[PDB]
Design a protein around this ligand. Structure first.
Ligand SMILES: [Zn+2]
Ligand SMILES: [Zn+2]
Length: 612
């Protein structure tokens, strides 16, 4: 016999998903006295990479040295790919540098090894070095560096690689089209991603999934759903990767009935038992204001891993069911499910929204000694929110300084929001400037500080803050409220008159306002950000978008039915008070999801405890 027979059988096993059989063959060849050649080693090393077995891979490296093939280009490229897929990028790089000759396959193995393992900068650096030497990149090369740009968020870089793909005539390769959509979406230019998606002559389910995900991640949930319907019209079958993004779009919109329709499709198509689909269903029901249906999904799941537990814990957290989240955190450990840093963000968030100060401190301090997990900046952010709700503003600011991280806008905004609740003008002042230094084009610090000054009677400084905001050309996005009625999502802006039942909506607000007034409600116009007469301020206040949505819900659903409102920005203090009164008057539960919290208004009381 000869090595050519063995190579044929090893090639067969290695390319049919039987790496262990290929390696078992390689061992037999060794005993039989037939020596491998430069064609055997890539297949056996690829088998090692398929199993993520560094030990055997290192043994084969030893055989490559002894056999005198330390200079063969294909063997060395196979060594690179083996070390990379085994999580040893330094060993792979060492092999790449010592090579006496490299072809394009060797560069792709090293570049892709970096991109697939997070080191996006070194991947692009390697790619720049590759182009100076004049080595033509293949379509796989471009897919790797496009994924590196997507990770880094550098849009201008991806635009460059896009031109390079146009130059190399790869723009019609299906994989390249998918990689470009993914890059543009994650870099923020969703229109250019759609431009690529429409131009593709051939689209797979991966192509549709990338376009749908991009829309869903950039908040554009309606276009995601429209493309998901279009995808069914063209005959492209969604799979277990498509559905989470579709569910995420439903989650953002808060359309509970649209979510249940996608849930039934999930059941029809047999994807319900998929673990990411189930976690997405939990999140979707939670985000749609139905903690009961999220719990039903969780309870009937045949398989519950860490992301399923995290999703259900996070679901209870954002609804302020703090004790239930912690009960689940305990139950999850008793069932042998190890927490992650995501679990701790959720249970610390649960302690925040429910005011469990002592519980939050103990969990946070227990992260490093009692688990393997060192706190990240979001865990410190949760703690700053916890201290803020407790009125311990000094502790919270000191924690921001004493933090072993760079303070970000989230952590300062948390403190700034806490300053508004507790009337801490000077600390609010400091927190605002810190936010402006980090993000000068954000409107939230200006509006917040103006509110601070106004509540404290400092009308002059409040006006100068608003004046400075207009000067710097910074504008806040208009408010917006959505409500699902009869399987349709109705949108309202402040003072809306475009709805076909405007007459009945405004008439219902008139009737309702008479009952609120008789119950003690007194409009507070102090923070109507409009330089107009008092009587005009009260008229604007009457028709803030969440009260239009509540009124539409009241005339469109039978009495006693819960109402579920989604607000894009924030529920102003007067609408929060107003909705407390309304919930008792109409005998309904009213659920408002604003940017930060879930407000459950029940019998004159809100679940947030008047801190948001
Ligand atoms: Zn309001
Ligand atoms: Zn509330």
């Amino acid at each position: 016999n000869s090595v050519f027979s063995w190579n044929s059988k090893i090639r067969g096993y290695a390319r049919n998903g039987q790496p262990e059989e290929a390696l078992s063959l390689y061992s037999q060849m060794r005993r039989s006295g037939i020596k491998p050649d430069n064609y055997t080693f890539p297949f056996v090393l690829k088998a090692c990479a398929s199993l993520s077995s560094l030990k055997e891979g290192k043994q084969i490296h030893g055989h490559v040295i002894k056999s005198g093939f330390e200079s063969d280009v294909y063997v060395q490229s196979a060594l690179i790919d083996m070390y990379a897929k085994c999580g040893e990028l330094e060993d792979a790089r060492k092999v790449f540098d010592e090579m006496p000759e490299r072809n394009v396959v060797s560069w792709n193995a090293m570049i892709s090894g970096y991109a697939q393992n997070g080191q996006s900068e070194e991947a692009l650096e390697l790619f720049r070095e590759m182009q100076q030497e004049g080595i033509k990149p293949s379509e796989f090369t471009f897919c790797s560096v496009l994924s590196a740009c997507a990770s880094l968020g550098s849009l201008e870089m991806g635009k460059q690689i896009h031109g390079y793909v146009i130059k190399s005539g790869f723009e019609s390769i299906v994989f390249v089209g998918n990689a470009l959509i993914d890059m543009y979406a994650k870099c923020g230019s969703i229109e250019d991603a759609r431009k690529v998606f429409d131009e593709m002559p051939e689209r797979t389910v991966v192509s549709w999934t990338a376009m749908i995900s991009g829309y869903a991640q950039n908040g554009q949930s309606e276009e995601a759903l429209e493309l998901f319907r279009e995808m069914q019209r063209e005959g492209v079958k969604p799979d277990e990767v498509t559905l989470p993004s579709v569910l995420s779009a439903c989650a953002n919109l808060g359309a509970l009935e649209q979510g249940k329709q996608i849930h039934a499709y999930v059941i029809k198509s047999g994807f319900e038992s998929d673990v990411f689909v189930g976690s997405a269903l939990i999140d979707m029901y939670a985000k749609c204001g139905s903690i009961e249906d999220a719990r039903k999904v969780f309870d009937k799941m045949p398989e519950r891993d860490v992301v399923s537990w995290n999703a259900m814990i996070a679901a209870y957290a954002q609804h302020g069911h703090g004790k239930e989240a912690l009960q689940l955190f305990q139950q999850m450990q008793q069932e042998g499910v190890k927490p992650s840093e995501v679990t701790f963000t959720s249970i610390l968030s649960a302690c925040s929204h429910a005011g469990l100060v002592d519980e939050g401190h103990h969990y946070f301090e227990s992260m490093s000694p009692d688990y393997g997990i060192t706190p990240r900046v979001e865990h410190y952010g949760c703690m700053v929110d916890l201290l803020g709700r407790a009125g311990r503003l000094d502790e919270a600011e000191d924690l921001i300084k004493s933090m072993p991280f760079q303070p970000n806008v989230v952590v300062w905004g948390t403190l700034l929001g806490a300053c508004r609740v507790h009337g801490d003008v000077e600390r609010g002042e400091r927190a605002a400037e810190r936010i402006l230094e980090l993000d000068p084009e954000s409107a939230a610090p200006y509006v917040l500080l103006s509110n601070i000054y106004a509540a404290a009677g400092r009308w002059d400084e409040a006006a100068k803050v608003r004046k400075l905001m207009k000067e710097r050309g910074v504008k806040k996005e208009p408010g917006c409220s959505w409500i699902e009625v009869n399987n349709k999502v109705h949108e309202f802006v402040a003072g809306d008159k475009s709805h076909p039942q405007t007459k009945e909506i405004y008439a219902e607000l008139e009737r309702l306002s008479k009952q609120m007034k008789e119950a003690g409600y007194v409009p507070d116009t102090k923070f109507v950000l409009h330089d107009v007469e008092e009587e005009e301020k009260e008229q604007l206040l009457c028709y803030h978008s969440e009260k239009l949505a509540i009124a539409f819900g009241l005339i469109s659903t039978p009495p006693g039915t819960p109402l579920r409102i989604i607000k894009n920005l924030r529920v102003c203090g007067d609408c929060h008070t107003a909705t407390k009164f309304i919930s008792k008057i109409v005998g309904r539960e009213i659920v408002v999801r604003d940017a930060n919290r879930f407000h459950h208004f029940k019998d004159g009381v809100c679940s947030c405890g008047d801190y948001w």
